[PDB]
């Protein structure tokens, strides 16, 4: 028997090469069945061919096989809560994928490795079925049918070694529950080893801080109950007993700071032992060392316990390193910013000695810019020597700014064509910009306001602004209530403190008016302006060109502006007419915003946001109306319309139209109006105060990925607006808008989606304290950057 020809069957990656490698014989060598055995074992070793038939036609070999490779495809059916990526982890963990193991015998292993996953999850009550759609020449689609009935259930956990304490009271801090409350009808009833470990360590910490050093754990035993429901636990422990702190015997390496080092360790006798306090104090010492700056100095305490009286003398040893490792830094995340834009804030610099406080404060001011997404950094030890350290501020930068457009329903023309745009670090520069306007068929408007916050090295903030509100009843320009105006406001901002800044500068403005409508406080102010036109028609005109001095103060001790969580910021702004100008007054305003986190989980948080404002004439004068405060608009207050709050318009019988479509217009003698026509439409006022109190709401059920990029709350908001220059002389016989007593109020929700297109919020609420006709909508939308 000598092989004359071999049919080297084997395909889809291999050829005659691998089979001939399998065979020991060429054409003209004695043939055997050791080739059969070697081929089968080698093909189970490699795992290509499920079987071999090395047969011989006389003395002519032939190879007939089946193949474990290609798995053409996979399907997953019934994987309710488990997602196919974790299934893929199980699969690659099995080394199983396309072009891999086969042999349906292995299904038990596969299902086992599936069961294992559930066996690890917390379940055991389930199974899986793999099914083969056979496909030609080797191939197979593997569909997986997941019989996932239900996981087992937590029942009751008992512990013994608890005389000083109830069990439930200490249970109360755990993730897990042997029973749900009713004031929280929802609540998990699941299992996890990790949460269990945390509860264990939590108990350990509890009995540490109540002083029990002889506390331990002996063990803990889970009930693995038939029928696949019952998980109790029984826990074995030492209660021990508390000790009492008696003394401290710290030592170590100090660099002569021993005084202040002790000043950390200053304590009262009779206070109980608590290793939490110990850890706290240790960390405080670490921080102190960071102040002078020491990278990796060692700490270690020693509780020298006296069991004769249950007390301890706490020795400590310490190992200070060295200082001024400050070689360099790095930054990562910058694809748009410029390096200087960081370093300007970095109170630390390269080539220095260290202070970690500097670095913390750098992160703080950084985030307080609110010009990024995520923040972190590492104090990367330098490998050249144990004497230098570099830093990397490997972080992320936000794409932001926003073009403004769109508004609630209204006229066919008059709900669009409105500009408004922000970059605020324009072109990745830190130059900050806001530009707006609107074209309409009854007015037009332009305004630009731009600042370089860092004209100089110091954070010198050079800001300038102009406007041209070309309002003349645009595209009519005749016999209509024109107020065309245009002016300038240009100032500076001074870094005063690490958290506090000032503002000071000037403005110079011109106004121009025509065909003014008889209204009451209008002519009040104007008779204070010393101009006494008629009170009947709208054939009237008036202009000004004035100067002013503006200024303000700002506090900001805060976390960020992306989605702030803790701290507060306030913007005070005052301004005044100057001497020599036409008009004489001041206007002063102040907007506060405070964030208080409940936990440092940074998910249940309080907001207090308010505005307080007042301005008034000088020289016994009245301010021009158009500088009045305003309110509502779902950007300061919601559940109302913008500028639709406070004292309101009041009308005379009008004696002048220069039109008559059908006299669609209100209150004229030409229409047939007398008997002074009170009205509803709003005007603004001189005095304002508003308040807002909100609970941050964690999101209902959202992916962390973008839930970190979304914010929400409920609120209760209210406020009010009024005049003092109101009277009762002829105001009588009307609703007197004098006093801050028609107080407006509502409450609702806030829904802050962060798109890449700017910040966007929809909103709902409901008015409660409504007064004389005031419009509103609860379902509202907006894009502005209000607080």
């Amino acid at each position, epitope marked *: 028997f000598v092989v004359k020809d071999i049919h080297f069957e084997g395909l889809q990656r291999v050829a005659v090469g691998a089979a001939l490698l399998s065979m020991p014989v060429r054409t003209g060598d004695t043939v055997n069945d050791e080739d059969i055995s070697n081929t089968i074992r080698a093909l189970f070793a490699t795992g290509n061919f499920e079987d071999v038939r090395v047969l011989r036609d006389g003395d002519t070999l032939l190879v007939q096989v089946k193949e474990r490779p290609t798995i053409a495809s996979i399907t997953f059916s019934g994987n309710k809560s488990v997602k196919d990526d974790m299934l893929k982890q199980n699969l690659e963990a099995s080394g199983v994928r396309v072009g891999e193991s086969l042999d349906r015998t292995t299904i038990a292993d596969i299902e086992k490795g599936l069961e294992d996953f559930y066996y690890s999850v917390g379940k055991y009550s389930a199974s899986v079925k793999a099914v083969v759609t056979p496909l030609p020449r080797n191939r197979v689609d593997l569909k997986l049918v997941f019989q996932e009935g239900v996981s087992a259930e937590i029942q009751q956990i008992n512990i013994v070694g608890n005389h000083a304490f109830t069990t439930d009271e200490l249970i109360s801090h755990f993730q897990l529950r042997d029973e749900v409350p009713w004031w929280n009808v929802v609540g998990d009833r699941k299992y996890q080893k990790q949460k269990l470990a945390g509860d264990l360590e939590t108990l350990r910490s509890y009995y540490l801080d109540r002083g029990y050093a002889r506390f331990n754990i002996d063990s803990t035993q889970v009930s693995l109950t038939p029928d696949k429901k019952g998980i109790y636990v029984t826990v074995n422990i030492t209660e021990g007993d508390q000790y009492k702190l008696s003394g401290v015997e710290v030592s170590g390496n100090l660099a002569g700071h021993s005084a202040e080092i002790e000043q950390l360790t200053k304590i009262e006798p009779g206070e109980l032992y608590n290793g939490t306090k110990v850890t706290k104090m240790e960390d405080d010492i670490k921080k102190l060392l960071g102040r002078y700056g020491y990278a990796y100095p060692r700490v270690q305490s020693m509780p020298e316990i006296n069991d004769a009286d249950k007390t301890v003398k706490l020795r400590v040893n310490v190992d200070a390193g060295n200082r001024f490792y400050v070689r360099k830094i790095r930054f990562e995340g910058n694809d748009t910013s410029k390096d200087a834009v960081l370093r300007r804030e970095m109170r630390q610099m390269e080539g220095a000695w260290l202070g970690s406080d500097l670095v913390d404060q750098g992160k703080e001011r950084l985030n307080r810019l609110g010009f990024f997404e995520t923040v972190d950094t590492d104090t990367q030890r330098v490998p050249g020597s144990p004497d230098q350290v570099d830093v990397v501020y490997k972080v992320k930068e936000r794409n932001t700014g926003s073009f403004n457009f769109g508004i609630g329903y209204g006229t066919e023309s008059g709900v669009s064509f409105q500009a408004g745009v922000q970059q605020d670090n324009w072109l990745g520069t830190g130059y900050a910009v806001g530009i707006n306007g609107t074209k309409n068929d009854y007015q037009t408007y332009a305004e630009l306001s731009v600042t370089n916050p860092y004209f100089t090295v110091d954070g010198v903030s050079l800001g300038g602004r102009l406007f041209y509100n070309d309002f003349q009843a645009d595209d009519a320009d005749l016999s209509d209530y024109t107020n065309k105006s245009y002016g300038t406001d240009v100032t500076l901002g001074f870094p005063i403190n690490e958290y506090n800044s000032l503002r000071a500068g000037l403005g110079y403005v011109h106004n121009s008016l025509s065909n003014m409508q008889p209204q009451v406080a209008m002519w009040r102010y104007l008779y204070s302006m*010393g*101009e006494h*036109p*008629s009170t009947s028609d709208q054939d009237n005109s*008036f202009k000004t060109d004035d100067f002013t001095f503006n200024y303000g103060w700002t506090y900001n001790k805060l976390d960020r502006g992306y989605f702030p969580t803790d701290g507060s910021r306030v913007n005070l702004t005052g301004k005044v007419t100057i001497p020599g100008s036409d008009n004489e007054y001041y206007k002063v305003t102040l907007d506060t915003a405070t964030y208080v986190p409940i936990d440092d989980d940074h998910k249940w948080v309080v907001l207090g946001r308010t505005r307080w404002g007042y301005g008034d004439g000088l020289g*016994g004068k009245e301010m021009p109306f158009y500088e009045n405060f305003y309110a509502g608009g779902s950007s300061t207050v919601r559940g109302f319309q913008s500028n639709t709050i406070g004292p309101k318009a009041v009308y005379f019988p009008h004696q002048a139209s220069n039109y008559d479509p059908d006299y669609d217009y209100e209150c004229a003698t030409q229409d047939g109006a007398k008997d002074l026509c009170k009205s509803d439409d709003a005007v603004g006022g001189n005095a304002m105060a508003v308040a807002s109190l909100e609970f941050i709401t964690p999101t209902p059920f959202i992916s962390d990925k973008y839930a970190n990029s979304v914010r929400t709350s409920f609120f209760w908001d209210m406020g009010t607006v009024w005049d003092t220059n109101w009277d009762s002389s*002829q105001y009588s016989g009307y609703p007197d808008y004098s006093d801050p007593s028609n107080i407006r109020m509502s409450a609702g929700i806030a829904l802050q989606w962060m798109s890449p297109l700017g910040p966007l919020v929809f909103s709902y609420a409901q008015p409660f304290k409504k007064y004389d006709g005031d419009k509103a909508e609860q379902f509202q939308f907006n894009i502005g950057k209000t607080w």
Partner: antibody
């Protein structure tokens, strides 16, 4: 306080410029008027000018023939009377208005009588 | 236009008695009247603003009453020096101005 300067006698149809000066008041921010009283107890408001030159009102009897102006720098009110008739002869008062309340006068001069006659 | 009706043109009364001077308005003005007193050979002076409010440094005796249809001035325990001619004035219609005829206060001896 309110000093007036004007014509004695002129012929109907001629022109005449009266001046009126304020001494102890600012003269700014004050609405100013010219009001004539004819012997015979007929009181007539003839003119009003605002603190600025934006709103000027004349009587329907007077019409544009007369011109009322003010100079804050010189604290002077200027009245030009053109197109003059015998009826125009009257006691002419330089009158002020009331700040911060409006809708009525506060100050009147002694009054300067003009008598036109051929 | 507006009619400042004032009657009687000339009045007279003794010292110590009160007087009610009627002033009637044609268009039922919503209380927008002013009272001015012109004594003989003197510049006219302000008596009442707002149609009921007395001017600074003036005795309380003078009072303003009535509505747009009709107003009245009350002087209580009038003294010898108050003899003057008193007029009404409306400011409700600003463009034009109508005065009263002047009420001439005499005394009774």
């Amino acid at each position: 306080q309110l000093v007036e300067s004007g014509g004695g006698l002129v012929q109907p149809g001629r022109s005449l410029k009266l001046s009126c000066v304020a001494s102890r008041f600012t003269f700014s921010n004050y609405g100013m008027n010219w009001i004539r009283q004819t012997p015979g107890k007929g009181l007539e408001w003839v003119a009003y000018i605002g603190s600025t030159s934006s709103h000027i009102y004349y009587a329907e009897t007077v019409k544009g023939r007369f011109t009322i102006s003010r100079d804050n720098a010189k604290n002077t009110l200027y009245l030009q009377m053109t197109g003059l008739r015998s009826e125009d002869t009257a006691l002419y008062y330089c009158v002020g208005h009331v700040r911060k309340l409006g809708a009525f006068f506060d100050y009147w001069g002694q009054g300067a009588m003009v008598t036109v006659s051929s | 236009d507006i009619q400042m009706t004032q009657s009687p043109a000339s009045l007279s009364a003794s010292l110590g008695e009160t007087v009610t001077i009627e002033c009637r308005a044609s268009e039922d003005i919503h209380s927008r009247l002013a009272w001015y007193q012109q004594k003989p050979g003197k510049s006219p002076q302000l008596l009442i603003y707002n149609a009921n409010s007395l001017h600074t440094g003036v005795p309380s005796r003078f009072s303003g009453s009535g509505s747009g249809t009709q107003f009245s001035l009350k002087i209580n325990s009038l003294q010898s020096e108050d003899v003057a001619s008193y007029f009404c004035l409306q400011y409700y219609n600003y463009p034009p101005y109508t005065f009263g005829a002047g009420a001439k206060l005499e005394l009774r001896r």
